[PDB]
Amino acid sequence: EALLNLYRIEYRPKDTTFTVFKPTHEIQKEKLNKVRWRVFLQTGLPTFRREDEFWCAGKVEKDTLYLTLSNGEIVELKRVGEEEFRGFQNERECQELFRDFLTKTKVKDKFISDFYKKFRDKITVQGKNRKIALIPEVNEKVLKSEEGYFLLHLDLKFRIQPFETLQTLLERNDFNPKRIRVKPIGIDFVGRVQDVFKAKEKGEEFFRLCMERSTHKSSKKAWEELLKNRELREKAFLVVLEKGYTYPATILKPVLTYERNEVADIVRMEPGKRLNLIRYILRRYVKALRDYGWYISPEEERAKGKLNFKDTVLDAKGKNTKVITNLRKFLELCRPFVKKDVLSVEIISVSVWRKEEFLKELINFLKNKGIKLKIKGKSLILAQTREEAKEKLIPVINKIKDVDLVIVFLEFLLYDFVKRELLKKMIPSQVILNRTLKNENLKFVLLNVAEQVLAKTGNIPYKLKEIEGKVDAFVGIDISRITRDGKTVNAVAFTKIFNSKGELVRYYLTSYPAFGEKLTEKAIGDVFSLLEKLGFKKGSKIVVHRDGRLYRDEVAAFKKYGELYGYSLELLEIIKRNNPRFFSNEKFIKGYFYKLSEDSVILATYNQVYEGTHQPIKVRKVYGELPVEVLCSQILSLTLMNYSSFQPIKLPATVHYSDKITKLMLRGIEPIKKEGDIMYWL
Ligand SMILES: [Ca+2]
């Protein structure tokens, strides 16, 4: 009844003797995780952090003081002796200690090397003028169940990386370095390139210093070479990454995303393939760690069940029908909620009397639905090939005209390019592919298109009848910032305020200047003053969905602005990346769940359509009066507010597209301050 990457993990050590280390100085949050790493390096025995005390697994002979040196340059001293271990207090401690065992027993290294021996041939992809490898990454995190047992969350993903180094690459040809996600060899880290400069620019002691300040071994050895090898040092580059971390171009390998696409889509794997592989990885950990006192359950943790949600939607006349794939029937007969009876549309065709026949049928379908499209201007473009990305650049730049919608007929980076540009100008866009009319049944395309054009223009086809829970507004936020050295430069906030019936009340997109705490606070106070501007009286229930992880600062701002305006707040974090997957043959997984400790739930938000393409989200109730199951049902109901009946959308309307829109506005030159009531991104 639905399996997951979760296995009951347990630790019952033989030699229960542990050496404690406490600093003679203070506590430094960001640095605590770095010290713990270094305590494990100098000692050689697995370590965990119990508040201030650094507990180490075993006996270190003659141990007095530990003089670990951090990245900063700050030296840290710590001493003390023994105490006997009686289980863990956190999942964090379990993970910290478990991980160091995988390292010291080199079992993840034996695996990586044994997976290359049989699979090197399969792992490699070749093209004309370039060669790529699909490097395996095994990420383990220790979670805690509802009941209280620790779960080893174990997955296997494939990191797409070129054979060539970032140095070999920067040497040959000068391609745009910034925003390129890179990763150091023996390091579990990925960051985006900020600054590139020559190693000639720095003298002898820099390399020796940055070597003495290097956290891992491959980096000690990379700085050792630039210092000791002058052939290298001259032609070498040093790369500064996002958070600050400086690494030599010599140990940096680029990380790729996006025929290569075809041969690299075998990486999606069948659910049986990851599951049996994860099952193969587990077995090796148990050989390597049973003697050390570790147990890992061979059996996956099964999901609890299906969470029903209110999927019933209705039109302007009030026709009710449950949404399982949204009837074509319902969308044929439905009367929309008209926001603009008459519309101004621009059209574009990328060609080499079907498009025309279709456009006419569209116009008619919608006319008989109350909305009339009035064509402002047909822009016909003539392709041969790619020369068009240029011949399309020209008409797109001028398309701000006053258009309500833009319909484009194309003959995949094509769809992607066009939508992004019309997203920047904030003009709703419907990109009809010529391949779609050729391949699908014209009525379904007409319907697929109908439902979507209606949503984009505020003339929504339907809205939910009931959402479980008496909540007065659903606000979804993502705040994306631009990092330059240390303190925040540019920032964009995108808020989406919704109804108890799921309809869009207002959105708010603003770019914010450079100030410390006044950023987070203004961004969230602005959100609050907007709710006030929208007539939300004192004591109204407000559910907030955060696209990312709610930073401590944000959680704060909310609670205080919740106190200030007298609102009943519910704060949810919506984590889409690196969650425990669901393995089963059910194919109708929407609503499936596994429940964790601090009211966190691994949830299936959409049904399995394409193979291996199933990413469950992790919903966390950071702050809240309502149960997670209730909040989860509302998330599930709001997925339907994305008006994509023929296609699936993983995210609730409150956060769907929120992270893509903010990161886009950041790449701007001008700041925004816009408010609307149109779902222009769809
Ligand atoms: Ca973000």
Side-chain angles (χ1 to χ4, degrees):
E1 310 172 30
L3 304 190
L4 292 106
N5 293 269
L6 306 159
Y7 306 89
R8 287 194 172 157
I9 185 166
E10 266 145 35
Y11 189 48
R12 307 179 209 296
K14 306 178 174 177
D15 187 88
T16 333
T17 322
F18 276 47
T19 309
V20 192
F21 287 105
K22 207 208 181 186
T24 337
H25 344 239
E26 309 167 335
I27 337 165
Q28 268 161 355
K29 288 188 181 173
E30 301 135 20
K31 304 170 190 178
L32 282 175
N33 247 286
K34 302 176 181 184
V35 179
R36 164 244 161 299
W37 172 250
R38 297 177 167 296
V39 189
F40 161 58
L41 290 190
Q42 279 205 41
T43 307
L45 298 160
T47 303
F48 75 85
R49 199 206 88 226
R50 217 172 245 195
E51 301 283 333
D52 268 342
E53 302 172 5
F54 295 75
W55 293 54
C56 306
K59 301 186 184 189
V60 202
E61 297 183 335
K62 304 157 182 173
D63 76 290
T64 324
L65 299 117
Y66 267 64
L67 311 160
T68 54
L69 172 84
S70 62
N71 296 307
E73 194 198 295
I74 318 168
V75 201
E76 292 104 28
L77 100 158
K78 27 188 208 66
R79 32 189 130 147
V80 192
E82 286 144 51
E83 253 200 89
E84 304 238 291
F85 179 76
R86 308 198 60 67
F88 308 93
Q89 311 183 351
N90 298 326
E91 311 110 63
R92 175 187 49 80
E93 300 177 11
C94 179
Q95 185 197 91
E96 295 188 352
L97 197 87
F98 183 70
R99 282 188 172 158
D100 293 352
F101 267 99
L102 308 183
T103 293
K104 194 50 179 168
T105 322
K106 299 165 197 180
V107 63
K108 208 200 291 214
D109 303 321
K110 203 205 176 188
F111 187 67
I112 278 150
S113 91
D114 285 45
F115 192 84
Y116 282 39
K117 291 201 175 196
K118 320 181 187 176
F119 299 67
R120 247 166 229 150
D121 341 307
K122 317 188 174 190
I123 281 169
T124 313
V125 180
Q126 290 120 347
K128 191 205 139 150
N129 313 292
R130 193 166 163 202
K131 206 180 174 186
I132 310 171
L134 306 145
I135 289 158
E137 66 191 334
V138 215
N139 286 16
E140 313 78 20
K141 268 159 184 156
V142 171
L143 310 200
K144 196 179 167 190
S145 63
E146 190 190 7
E147 321 208 298
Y149 310 81
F150 292 155
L151 308 172
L152 178 64
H153 165 15
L154 175 46
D155 215 329
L156 183 78
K157 292 172 183 183
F158 290 94
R159 192 65 89 187
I160 315 168
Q161 275 178 22
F163 270 72
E164 314 112 66
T165 296
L166 192 64
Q167 190 52 62
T168 308
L169 271 163
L170 290 174
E171 258 181 62
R172 71 194 210 202
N173 276 327
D174 270 355
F175 67 130
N176 311 290
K178 294 171 183 207
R179 291 175 188 281
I180 289 178
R181 304 214 161 174
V182 274
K183 177 223 175 186
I185 299 183
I187 307 183
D188 244 318
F189 173 70
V190 168
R192 292 201 192 159
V193 182
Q194 187 177 357
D195 256 18
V196 174
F197 69 98
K198 298 168 199 160
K200 310 211 189 233
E201 237 182 275
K202 299 295 177 163
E204 291 215 87
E205 268 179 75
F206 189 87
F207 306 111
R208 194 167 229 226
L209 278 176
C210 241
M211 193 218 289
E212 279 174 6
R213 290 174 202 171
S214 52
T215 31
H216 289 246
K217 190 194 187 175
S218 47
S219 51
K220 280 192 183 171
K221 275 192 208 162
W223 290 108
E224 199 180 340
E225 297 309 296
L226 309 173
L227 176 67
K228 299 191 189 184
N229 187 354
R230 282 176 79 136
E231 243 190 298
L232 225 195
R233 198 208 295 210
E234 274 175 49
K235 61 143 211 169
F237 298 110
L238 304 182
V239 186
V240 190
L241 305 187
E242 29 193 28
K243 309 171 181 174
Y245 303 55
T246 305
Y247 288 117
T250 60
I251 53 141
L252 292 165
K253 261 187 166 202
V255 171
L256 319 171
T257 308
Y258 279 145
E259 299 170 33
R260 291 180 186 199
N261 292 280
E262 269 181 42
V263 211
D265 267 3
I266 322 171
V267 122
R268 291 184 183 194
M269 289 200 275
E270 294 170 344
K273 289 173 176 166
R274 297 201 148 120
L275 187 68
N276 295 178
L277 220 355
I278 284 160
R279 285 172 194 223
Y280 188 72
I281 310 171
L282 274 198
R283 299 190 202 199
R284 290 177 187 228
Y285 282 176
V286 204
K287 270 201 178 206
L289 314 192
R290 232 186 295 138
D291 295 355
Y292 297 86
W294 290 95
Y295 179 75
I296 304 175
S297 197
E299 291 231 288
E300 285 73 22
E301 293 292 294
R302 280 113 222 255
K304 291 177 63 184
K306 194 197 160 166
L307 206 64
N308 286 290
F309 55 94
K310 303 293 184 178
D311 34 22
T312 303
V313 306
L314 43 58
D315 74 335
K317 232 194 166 182
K319 268 173 195 165
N320 328 324
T321 322
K322 281 179 182 176
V323 160
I324 302 140
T325 306
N326 309 58
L327 314 191
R328 277 95 186 250
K329 279 176 172 171
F330 178 61
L331 285 165
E332 270 174 60
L333 287 158
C334 82
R335 176 190 175 197
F337 292 88
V338 295
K339 189 172 288 183
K340 206 178 174 175
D341 36 45
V342 160
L343 263 44
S344 54
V345 181
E346 262 252 311
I347 294 147
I348 298 94
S349 57
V350 148
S351 339
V352 167
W353 305 84
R354 279 218 197 125
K355 303 177 202 192
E356 304 233 19
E357 245 189 37
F358 186 71
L359 183 92
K360 286 176 181 178
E361 280 174 9
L362 264 40
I363 284 171
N364 215 76
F365 200 67
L366 308 182
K367 255 173 183 154
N368 295 336
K369 252 168 194 187
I371 309 94
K372 306 144 198 175
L373 306 201
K374 289 189 167 171
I375 307 158
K376 229 189 187 185
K378 299 183 181 187
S379 318
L380 158 56
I381 293 163
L382 261 132
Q384 293 183 20
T385 306
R386 298 162 168 200
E387 299 181 331
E388 196 171 58
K390 304 167 169 181
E391 289 185 23
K392 216 192 307 181
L393 258 159
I394 320 181
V396 165
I397 303 158
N398 309 294
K399 219 170 301 144
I400 325 195
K401 291 176 182 180
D402 215 344
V403 266
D404 289 337
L405 179 62
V406 172
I407 307 186
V408 186
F409 295 101
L410 298 178
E411 193 67 34
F412 295 105
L413 302 181
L414 282 169
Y415 173 103
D416 294 348
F417 163 69
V418 191
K419 275 276 247 192
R420 288 188 323 201
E421 301 278 315
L422 287 171
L423 245 179
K424 295 186 198 185
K425 297 158 175 276
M426 300 168 295
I427 308 149
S429 41
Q430 188 73 68
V431 175
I432 310 179
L433 285 182
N434 268 276
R435 218 180 168 215
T436 306
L437 302 157
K438 272 273 251 191
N439 298 322
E440 281 173 5
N441 190 256
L442 302 186
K443 278 176 201 162
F444 306 158
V445 190
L446 180 93
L447 284 169
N448 188 310
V449 167
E451 176 191 41
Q452 279 188 276
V453 157
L454 289 172
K456 287 152 171 70
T457 58
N459 312 283
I460 60 154
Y462 51 82
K463 67 182 184 170
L464 293 149
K465 172 196 178 128
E466 190 59 53
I467 282 174
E468 189 180 323
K470 295 166 199 180
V471 167
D472 302 358
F474 296 83
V475 349
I477 321 192
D478 189 289
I479 297 179
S480 286
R481 305 138 185 252
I482 277 179
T483 320
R484 270 196 206 163
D485 287 31
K487 277 130 194 178
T488 318
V489 175
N490 193 15
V492 177
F494 188 44
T495 303
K496 257 180 277 226
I497 305 160
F498 286 87
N499 225 319
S500 60
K501 301 304 155 196
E503 76 204 304
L504 189 72
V505 181
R506 285 303 152 126
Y507 62 74
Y508 194 62
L509 183 50
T510 324
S511 203
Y512 285 105
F515 24 51
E517 299 181 326
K518 304 186 230 139
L519 248 193
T520 313
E521 287 269 332
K522 216 151 298 180
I524 295 157
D526 277 79
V527 163
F528 274 86
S529 66
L530 182 56
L531 284 161
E532 192 209 326
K533 284 169 202 182
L534 286 165
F536 281 100
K537 315 150 197 192
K538 182 178 174 166
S540 54
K541 181 75 80 49
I542 287 170
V543 179
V544 179
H545 293 181
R546 180 64 174 77
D547 181 280
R549 272 210 178 245
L550 262 164
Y551 301 93
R552 186 230 195 153
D553 313 69
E554 311 181 334
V555 187
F558 277 105
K559 297 178 168 171
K560 291 159 182 186
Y561 274 108
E563 267 156 19
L564 252 139
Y565 290 80
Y567 296 143
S568 186
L569 252 63
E570 306 280 320
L571 300 180
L572 309 189
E573 267 181 0
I574 289 174
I575 288 83
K576 43 268 171 65
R577 259 165 284 182
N578 313 321
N579 296 316
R581 291 204 219 79
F582 285 111
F583 310 103
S584 45
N585 305 284
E586 180 69 56
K587 290 170 225 185
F588 268 95
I589 285 155
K590 179 170 189 178
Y592 278 39
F593 73 113
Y594 186 88
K595 194 175 177 237
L596 300 165
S597 53
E598 307 153 17
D599 258 1
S600 40
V601 172
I602 295 145
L603 187 63
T605 40
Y606 70 115
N607 314 296
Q608 296 186 291
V609 180
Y610 292 114
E611 310 182 301
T613 316
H614 202 265
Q615 323 236 60
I617 76 164
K618 170 176 146 163
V619 176
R620 186 188 157 192
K621 180 178 95 180
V622 182
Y623 190 79
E625 174 195 297
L626 300 177
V628 254
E629 291 105 354
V630 175
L631 303 165
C632 287
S633 156
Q634 309 175 324
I635 265 162
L636 279 173
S637 293
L638 287 170
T639 50
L640 317 190
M641 287 323 265
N642 286 307
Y643 307 95
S644 179
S645 49
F646 303 94
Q647 280 171 37
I649 289 189
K650 177 175 158 196
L651 292 186
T654 50
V655 290
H656 175 248
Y657 246 53
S658 285
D659 202 76
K660 292 185 186 194
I661 297 168
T662 61
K663 282 170 174 178
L664 186 74
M665 299 316 154
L666 275 179
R667 299 182 175 207
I669 267 156
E670 308 210 47
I672 354 94
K673 186 213 163 287
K674 209 203 200 169
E675 191 197 303
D677 52 345
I678 296 140
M679 295 187 71
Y680 72 88
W681 46 90
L682 298 179

